[PDB]
Amino acid sequence: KETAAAKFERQHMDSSTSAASSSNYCNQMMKSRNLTKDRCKPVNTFVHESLADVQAVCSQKNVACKNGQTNCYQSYSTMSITDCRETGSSKYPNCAYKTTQANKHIIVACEGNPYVPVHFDASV
Ligand SMILES: Nc1ncnc2c1ncn2[C@@H]1O[C@H](COP(=O)(O)O)[C@@H](O)[C@H]1O
Numbered sequence: 001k002e003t004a005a006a007k008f009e010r011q012h013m014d015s016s017t018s019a020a021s022s023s024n025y026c027n028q029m030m031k032s033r034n035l036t037k038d039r040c041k042p043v044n045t046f047v048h049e050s051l052a053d054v055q056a057v058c059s060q061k062n063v064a065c066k067n068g069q070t071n072c073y074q075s076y077s078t079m080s081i082t083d084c085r086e087t088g089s090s091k092y093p094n095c096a097y098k099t100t101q102a103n104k105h106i107i108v109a110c111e112g113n114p115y116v117p118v119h120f121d122a123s124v
Pocket residue numbers: 065067069070071072109110111118119
């Protein structure tokens with residue numbers, strides 16, 4: 001089965017690009033990462049940093065999660081990320097997104113042994 005850890009990597013990791021590939025990036029990536037499979041996933045963030053760097057966030061600044069759990073962590077450094085947001089004109093199965101690149105601190109929830117990212121909570 002797909003572990004939660006693998007699912008985080010599929011949904012949120014993109015170390016290959018340093019930053020968003022112009023205007024087409026979200027359209028292609030949301031599809032290729034299977035987030036347009038059974039609906040247009042409305043909102044999603046990709047992180048353009050090494051896996052090791054993202055994993056290391058599980059030992060950085062402990063902050064409250066949006067759902068009220070205590071297992072969330074904020075990166076001490078800013079990271080290169082891309083926010084994808086579904087357009088008003090987007091209609092399944094033709095899912096359309098705005099690609100917005102930025103540099104922000106990420107917030108991830110971590111679980112397990114090893115203690116790794118399983119949920120992307122926020123960027124700040
Ligand atoms: N603190 C957390 N630790 C682990 N997974 C979480 C956490 N917060 C949210 N999730 C995951 O993200 C989804 C969205 O959370 P919610 O909006 O509370 O339904 C949940 O179904 C979980 O799959």
